[PDB]
Structure 1
């Protein structure tokens, strides 16, 4: 019963592989780069037919978390090659090899949570992505649905919440949470994204010392979104892998409730000591609630990493980091 995990060197993938191996289960990784764990893994690409064949031999179940997420147009062809065509051929290879279950990591971008038609967003919400990435995940879901209806291989679609390791939340250098909660990282981010008007706007709000940012829309409505701990995502993925009721299912996977930035930022500020700069962005901004009621009542999923628990652990890590910079 070997389990194949693609994206096994990534945030969610590596934690899934570690949980499985801690259970003593046989796992094979599949990622562009080594995990650094020395465990069995393919180093290679989802675009490579040879790698796909090597990866699937003797495999009983597949956790397909490997995907490319990019903003720039120059990366769009690659994103479709990896996310759509890579997923298509991985499905066909899995099916032909007699894989028993295939779990697919999708995204809230298939709805999209950035522009919902109603709240809370349920699995029955229309799938109308507005980003090329979200489009790739929708096409991916459609490939999965085809195998679901047509073969012996069981499938599960899991639409991921935005996911962070707790320690990422209070790290200015983290890819997502830095720009999300800290003003200067966001300036650098937007500069690199080439969003000139935004980067100079943010610049205009800098107060002479590092600060947090409380993001709001043009009407002063604070951003609101789900941020789920990697450990809760791992728990849901293992449920999708093992629970009998997950077969043929599609589930939102994430924490119960979103974080409202008007309540989150002062909690973050209380742990960092940094002041808060409030910025009203042009547009309607971000504001969503996503229901995980289906996965809770079907698979018995229970998220346990509340923002408070996550923040408590993020803060401890930040303080240990400082004490090295500080040498205190």
Structure 2
């Protein structure tokens, strides 16, 4: 059995690639290496096949899909801010690739696709509340609108052409191989890289902001279950733990792990920042086997010891 993983050379995708190969799958990666890196992949694993190109390219997707039993669709420009700066270009990666994938899967008779949607589809709705999947949508950026549009098209292909989409709205994923080089990189990747290097961090605001952080290995387990479940539900599932971690908690946790004090410069609160973000993960608990997820401290330590 062969799994196509678009965006398989990236942060989440490469961890998924490792897990699928360890389970005995043949794995085909489609990645344009815009942010993905070949160093993330087990090149030389005989079960792994790398295709380099644009997931929005119809002819290449027809090749990439042939001989595949299922698909995990992770390819997108992950930076929300890149979509603000270039709506036209990012719309190709963040929506057209989904549409093209629907067409290629339908023509080839492949049903199961696991899709990386995003908590950004909610906008600021549900600030301060456990965010359920029926929370009203308010996508504020091209990236968020394209993720939600991808959801709606995937649902149309389900009803009209028999597709089996597994729609997952990721909350704040973290772990090894997450790039900390951009200012808008995940806060954990940035704080961890600075703490390892003994360099100061900048806290934007008072640090009371809370996020529902998910360690990448726990998300990977969900992704694999999405591929293997017999009859997945038709509607979206939040991927969060319902956890509440303040940034000040995160700073203290890293300081304890690094064994050295973290110098904390004070920045203003980011414009448009959501203060309190937490998933209601009832659907996740009901539809998937969550086992015992990594605690924040366990995830931070696995990340920090990998740097």
Superposition TM-score, scaled by structure 1 size: 0.79
Q: CA deviation at 1:129?
A: 0.8
Q: CA deviation at 1:137?
A: 0.3
d(CA) in 1 for partners of 2:114, 2:94: 14
Q: CA deviation at 1:312?
A: 2.2
Q: Spell out, residue by residue over 1:73-105, the C-alpha distance to the aligned partner (whole angstroms, 9 max, x if none).
A: 553211111221111011111012111311111
Aligned residues: 290
Query: For 1:3, what is the secondary structure of its paired residue?
Result: strand
Alignment pair present for 1:264 and 2:258: no
Aligned equivalent of 2:227: 241
Q: CA deviation at 1:279?
A: 4.1
Q: CA deviation at 1:317?
A: 3.6
Q: CA deviation at 1:167?
A: 7.2
d(CA) in 1 for partners of 2:299, 2:194: 23
Could you say if the C-alpha distance between residues 184 and 281 of structure 1 is closer, same or farther in structure 2, counting changes exceeding 3 Å? farther
Listed as ranges, the gaps of 5+ residues in structure 2 are none
1:161-176 maps to which residues of 2 (within 5 A)?
Answer: 161-166=171-176, 175-176=185-186
Aligned equivalent of 1:198: none
Q: Spell out, residue by residue over 1:155-214, the C-alpha distance to the aligned partner (whole angstroms, 9 max, x if none).
A: 110111221215769x788943378538989xxxxxxxxxxxxxxxxxxxxxxx942334
Which structure has the larger Rg?
1
Aligned equivalent of 1:158: 168
Q: Spell out, residue by residue over 1:254-310, the C-alpha distance to the aligned partner (whole angstroms, 9 max, x if none).
A: 333132113221222223322334445265733211122211112222352211101
**2:281 equivalent among 289, 292, 300:** 292
d(CA) in 2 for partners of 1:282, 1:49: 39
Aligned-residue Cα RMSD (Å) equals 2.8
Aligned equivalent of 1:109: 120
Alignment pair present for 1:275 and 2:284: no
d(CA) in 2 for partners of 1:250, 1:215: 31
Is the 1:4–1:55 contact (alpha carbons within 8 Å) kept by the matching residues of 2? yes
d(CA) in 1 for partners of 2:203, 2:125: 20
Query: For 2:173, what is the secondary structure of its paired residue?
Result: strand
d(CA) in 1 for partners of 2:87, 2:177: 30
Alignment pair present for 1:128 and 2:149: no
Aligned equivalent of 1:51: 60
Aligned equivalent of 2:305: 316
d(CA) in 1 for partners of 2:182, 2:292: 27
